């Protein structure tokens, strides 16, 4: 070790090799008439099948003493259970299949976005397709970078919280719909506006916090491609894990605050 | 030549002289009336100046007393009825043969000439009595005394230079701002609107009159210490 | 000026209104100081 | 919109997510929750005697 | 610009005010000191 | 894109090696501690049953 930090490996084709930026918001892969399949939907399937396979492997021959995949699955599930019970101890059972799967889907979606080939591998500086007459559309885009997936999660969560806020405390909802006297009347409209904002805020938060990370990884691959984006690879791993956990946490916290 | 600030300064001088002569006309124990008010004000100021430094509280007291008694009455003269309305002429009353309707009663501190006099006299006061009992160490820059102590010793000197400038500028600025605010609020609604600003103006004038003397004595205290 | 006259009237009214309350405590303090002097 | 929002794609993603929710509830969530409650009930039975 | 003559006149008026105030208040300060 | 794929694959491999040399041991220790605790708990329950 010593002080052998030379960083000469960092001085390898600083910006001549990789393309300039090459980023976009959403694209279409199609492949079937009717539904315009996207690259995000491809990952949203390759993660869904991955999660299902992981579940089958973990629950394969459930033993009394945990081992391996069963053990880590039990640890994750019970940690999430305790985390949600810390907020509300009554609706954990009902809200768990949705909130836990939000976490388990968003986590693997974000972590798949850092797999090699997310932007390098695609279909029809100059990459490869650009040598031909057709543009290079990238495959394997992280699903959380899609505004059709994050908004789907947000609207599902909003429907869930509204359903369980109307199934409890009665259909009054006088705290936000309308109040007769006091400053609570003025507070109610602001609360309604915030509640309407809430799914938009959640979807925009997830989509931005993943898309900006992917764009950062690509652009810092553009300049000094080797050994410089390692700390930011780590930071984006952590940010993916966070944005996975906090989405679940916020869904359950909003559910609890709606019930109360 | 003279301006309309000097006539108000002279009328404030006349008012101060009359009040002092009335107070000193009948000097006796157990004061009651105007002399009681003046004695209470003077003793309160005496205690206030003692709190900072009791060594020079009995030495520079008449100077700060005159400063307060002049600036306070000059500021209060700006809120009296007739100030800014009486015209000397070298819609308005003086529209015919228009001469901008020069206000006869202009507050003494609402100019750049009178207010600079107190600033320069305070500057020469701190420079004189600061050098009285300190020798060269009064304005000593302490060149590299405690590690290039000259740098801090230099930047502090310009602060001393601008302190009278800051004092005069603040007095003129607050007096002029009060006068213009009174005129503007009068123009907006002629009655019952500047009521929160009428009492604010006199309070600000009195506060700045007191703080001028307080700041000068604080500068004198930190000049010898 | 009518505006100047109205401004002076409003200023006098506000001055009297404030000065009544100010002088009440001021008169009380002055009387207390005079009594405590002797 | 130019930001890639399409109702059919959003509906398809919602359907995929719901199918994932139900499958995971019937494959991982129920068995693992059953095992955790079994462990807790075994602990309670042991501390009973 | 500022009229230096007006500033000098204001300074002279202030000095005269200080002199008059000191002359008048020499009796009041002495009376206050003797009484208390 | 045979110039950014090499950049990602090398960088991803370095990140994986760093995590395996910095986080694999604590998480393995935590999982082993969980396994030991649960196995000792079920062993104690069986012993009390016995």
């Amino acid at each position: 070790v010593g002080a052998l930090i030379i960083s000469i490996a960092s001085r390898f084709f600083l910006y001549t090799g990789p393309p300039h930026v090459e980023v976009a918001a959403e694209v279409i892969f199609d492949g079937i008439p009717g539904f315009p399949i996207t690259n995000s939907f491809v990952v949203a399937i390759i993660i869904d099948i991955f999660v299902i396979a992981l579940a089958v492997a973990a629950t394969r021959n459930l033993q009394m003493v945990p081992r391996g995949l069963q053990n880590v699955m039990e640890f994750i599930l019970e940690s999430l259970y305790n985390l949600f019970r810390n907020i509300n101890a009554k609706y954990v059972a009902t809200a768990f299949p949705l909130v836990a799967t939000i976490f388990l889907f968003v986590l693997f979606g974000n972590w798949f976005g850092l797999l090699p080939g997310v932007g390098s591998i695609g279909v029809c500086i100059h990459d490869t397709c650009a040598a031909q007459g057709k543009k290079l559309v990238p495959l394997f885009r992280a699903p959380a970078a899609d505004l059709n997936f994050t908004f789907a999660i947000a609207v599902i969560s909003f429907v869930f919280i509204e359903y369980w806020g109307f199934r409890a405390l009665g259909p009054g909802y006088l705290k936000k719909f309308f109040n007769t006297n006091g400053i609570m009347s003025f507070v109610g409209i602001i609360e309604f506006i915030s509640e309407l904002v809430k799914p938009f805020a959640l979807a925009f938060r997830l989509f931005g916090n993943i898309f900006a990370g992917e764009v950062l990884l690509v652009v810092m691959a553009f300049l000094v491609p080797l050994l410089l984006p390692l700390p930011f690879y780590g930071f984006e791993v952590f940010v993916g894990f966070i944005q996975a956990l906090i989405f679940a946490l916020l869904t359950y916290a909003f559910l609890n605050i709606a019930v109360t | 030549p003279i301006t309309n600030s000097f006539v108000v300064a002279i009328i404030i001088d006349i008012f101060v002289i009359a009040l002092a002569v009335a107070a000193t006309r009948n000097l006796q124990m157990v004061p009651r009336g105007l002399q009681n008010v003046m004695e209470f004000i003077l003793e309160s100021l005496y205690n206030l100046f003692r709190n900072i430094n009791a060594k020079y509280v009995a030495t520079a007291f008449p100077l700060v007393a005159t400063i307060f008694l002049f600036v306070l009455f000059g500021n209060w003269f700006g809120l009296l009825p007739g100030v800014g309305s009486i015209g000397v002429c070298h819609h308005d009353t003086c529209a015919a043969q228009g001469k901008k309707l020069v206000p006869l009663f202009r507050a003494p501190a609402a100019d750049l000439n009178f207010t600079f006099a107190i600033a320069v006299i305070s500057f020469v006061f701190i420079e004189y009595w600061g050098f009285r009992a300190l020798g060269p160490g009064y304005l000593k820059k302490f060149f590299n005394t405690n590690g290039i102590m000259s740098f801090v010793g230099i930047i502090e000197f310009i602060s001393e230079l601008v302190k009278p400038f800051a004092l005069a500028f603040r007095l003129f600025g607050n007096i002029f701002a009060g006068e213009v605010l009174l005129v503007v609020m009068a123009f907006l609604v002629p009655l019952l609107l500047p009521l929160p600003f009428y009492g604010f103006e006199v309070f600000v004038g009195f506060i700045q009159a007191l703080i001028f003397a307080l700041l000068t004595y604080a500068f004198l205290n930190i000049a010898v210490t | 000026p009518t505006l100047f006259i109205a401004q002076l009237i409003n200023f006098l009214l506000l001055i009297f209104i404030l000065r009544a309350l100010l002088y009440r405590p001021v008169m009380n303090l002055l009387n207390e100081r005079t009594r405590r002097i002797e | 919109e130019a930001l890639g929002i399409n109702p059919t794609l959003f509906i398809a993603q919602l359907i995929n997510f719901l199918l994932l929710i139900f499958i995971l509830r019937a494959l991982l969530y129920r068995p693992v929750m059953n095992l955790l409650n079994e462990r807790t009930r075994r602990i309670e039975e042991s501390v009973r005697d | 610009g500022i009229n230096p003559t007006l500033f000098i006149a204001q300074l002279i008026n202030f000095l005269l005010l200080i002199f008059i105030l000191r002359a008048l208040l020499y009796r009041p300060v002495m009376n206050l000191l003797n009484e208390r | 894109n045979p110039t950014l794929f090499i950049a990602q694959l090398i960088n991803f491999l370095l990140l994986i090696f760093i995590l395996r040399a910095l986080l694999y041991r604590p998480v393995m220790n935590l999982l082993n501690e969980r396994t030991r605790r649960i196995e000792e708990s079920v062993r104690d329950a069986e012993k009390v049953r016995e």
Binding site: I87, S194, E195, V197, K198, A201, A253, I257, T260 | - | - | - | - | -
Partner: protein, 72 residues
């Protein structure tokens, strides 16, 4: 002026977040400090922490929505 709407969107997003960013931090820091001082009162203080967070987030999303409308 050949792209003033871009500046409008940037100002709407940028200026609308420097206020709520401090507010959310102050809210959650106060909540954490109160939790540490008194561990018992947790399930009820978070109820007000989250309504404050919701109001602040609504204030920021106002600017975000205004920026998107100019973008549209």
């Amino acid at each position: 002026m050949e792209g003033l709407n871009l500046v409008a969107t940037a100002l709407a997003v940028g200026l609308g977040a420097i206020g709520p960013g401090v507010g959310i931090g102050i809210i959650v820091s106060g909540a954490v400090q109160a939790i540490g001082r008194n561990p018992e009162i947790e399930n009820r203080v978070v109820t007000y922490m989250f309504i404050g967070i919701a109001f602040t987030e609504a204030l920021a999303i106002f600017g975000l929505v205004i920026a998107f409308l100019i973008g549209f």
